[PDB]
Amino acid sequence: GSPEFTPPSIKKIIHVLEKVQYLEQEVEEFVGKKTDKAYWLLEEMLTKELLELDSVETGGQDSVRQARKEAVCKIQAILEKLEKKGL
């Protein structure tokens, strides 16, 4: 048919990454607390997306390994930003 751009499964990497982008913007607002029930869930939701992306087994996919590592790094930046939003 046609070559097109962006494979089929790659779309998920975008879908998941798109989710992280929204989570980041939410953190900036999030006025939760380090010991708040929402904060736990807030950190919980972030870790959840990271757990989904870090669930692929793969084997010889450089594109996946690169995206997987980059995605996890993003969660790290937000995780700390939240640690200071709680208190």
From Swiss-Prot:
The reported effect of residue 54 to A is: Abolishes interaction with HSP70
Consequence of changing residue 44 to A: Reduces interaction with HSP70
Lineage top rank: taxon: Eukaryota
Q: What is the effect of changing residue 76 to A?
A: Abolishes interaction with HSP70
| Location of the BAG domain | 9-86
User: Tissue expression, per UniProt?
Assistant: Ubiquitous.
**Where, per UniProt, does this protein localize?**
Cytoplasm
User: How does this protein assemble?
Assistant: Binds to the ATPase domain of HSP/HSC70 chaperones. Binds to the death domain of TNFRSF1A in the absence of TNF and thereby prevents binding of adapter molecules such as TRADD or TRAF2. Binds to the death domain of TNFRSF12. Interacts with PRKN.
What role is this protein assigned?
A: Inhibits the chaperone activity of HSP70/HSC70 by promoting substrate release. Prevents constitutive TNFRSF1A signaling. Negative regulator of PRKN translocation to damaged mitochondria.
Name of protein: BAG family molecular chaperone regulator 4
Please indicate which part of the intact protein appears here, giving the first and last residue numbers and the full length. 376 to 457 of 457
